[PDB]
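Troubleshooting log. The previous run stalled partway through. Resubmitting the same two chains, unchanged.
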Amino acid sequence: FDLNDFLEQKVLVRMEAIINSMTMKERAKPEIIKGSRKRRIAAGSGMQVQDVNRLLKQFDDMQRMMKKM
RNA sequence: GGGGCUGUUUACCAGGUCAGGUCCGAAAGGAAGCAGCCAAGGCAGUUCC
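Second attempt completed without errors. Output:
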């Protein structure tokens, strides 16, 4: 369950923009996503890092769940 | 070394374009610009000087 899937699945049109600013690698192996990259993404989608941290927060919750079934 | 070609590689760190999203504006409209792509670079092979 990489970000690509999580992507498929008004405040959404705001979350999509955030993934549309990543790179296939990022969307494939998120752990690699740290400081510097986050700064790129947020600014890349008129967001802020908190917004990004949240989405990633959302994905984590979403992933962990599936990693449990 | 340089030119050409081919394969491969490269988040951001003054290339171009810029979906999506963002900024400013009552509007008309401007502004910046990620991913992508292109270009460019890196690592090689080949060929020409």
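Takeaways: The helical segments of chain A are 3-8, 13-19, 24-28, 35-44, 49-66. The longest helix of chain A spans residues 49-66.
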